[PDB]
From Swiss-Prot:
GO terms for cellular component: cytosol. Residues 21-151 form the MOSC domain. This is Protein YiiM. The lineage of its organism: Bacteria, Pseudomonadati, Pseudomonadota, Gammaproteobacteria, Enterobacterales. Gene3D superfamilies: PK beta-barrel domain-like. Monomer. It comes from Escherichia coli (strain K12). One of its GO terms (biological process) is response to toxic substance. One of its GO terms (molecular function) is protein homodimerization activity. PROSITE patterns: MOSC.
Length: 214
């Protein structure tokens, strides 16, 4: 863990909903999320990498204009952070608040309704370009002018592997045991990996990904 000492700092665009509109000054980050916005604690903030938009536009040239932040619902938009360099448990200082990565975002069939593309959820899930959520470790003033500083790297499980373990690999107790060991793991994901260990099976994903057609 030398990255803690590198003082990594990433500028971020901020958005809140009434849906999501860009915020420009300073607002309060409370335990439940951004003031004026809307496993509550574990999902108070959403993140989606801007890089991913190039991939969707190149994939769906015809509806390229739908693919711009914050089309995926995210609160935070950055360059330079993705599923392969963000780790489960990472704690970041933002202005005066402390936030911790708690799980990858799970793609939902509602996404398909929103882009009017019938298999975007399945595609998000298959590519692993899903973003992630934070739980707020300490509330406080934050701002669109204040960058995200990495301050603690406490696990060796990346968002990418956490997503592969949940959705890309065949049943494996060891991996489920490894995922349960990552600090900051949200309650619902703890519940889901624990249930697979006990049941001996992988819970269905059709309803989440396809709605009534699942």
């Amino acid at each position: 863990f030398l990255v803690e000492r590198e003082q990594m700092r990433y500028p971020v665009d901020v958005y809140t909903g009434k849906a999501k509109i860009q915020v420009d000054g300073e607002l309060m980050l409370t335990e439940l999320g951004l003031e004026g916005d809307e496993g509550g604690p574990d999902r108070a903030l959403c993140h989606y990498p801007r890089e991913h938009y190039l991939y969707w536009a190149r994939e769906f040239p015809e509806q390229a204009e739908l693919f711009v932040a914050p089309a995926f619902g995210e609160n935070l938009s950055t360059d330079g952070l993705t599923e392969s360099n963000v780790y489960m448990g990472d704690i970041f200082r933002w202005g005066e608040a402390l936030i911790q990565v708690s799980q990858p975002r799970s793609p939902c069939y509602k996404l398909n309704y929103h882009f009017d593309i019938s298999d975007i959820a399945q595609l998000m899930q298959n590519t692993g370009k899903v973003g992630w959520l934070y739980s707020v470790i300490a509330p406080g003033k934050v701002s669109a002018d204040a960058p995200l500083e990495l301050v603690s790297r406490v696990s060796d499980v990346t968002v990418q592997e956490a997503a592969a373990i949940a959705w890309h690999m065949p049943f494996d107790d060891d991996q489920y045991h490894r995922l349960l060991s990552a600090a900051g793991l949200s309650k619902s994901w703890t519940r889901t990996m624990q249930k697979r260990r006990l049941s001996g099976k992988i819970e269905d994903f059709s309803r989440r990904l396809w709605g009534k057609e699942g």
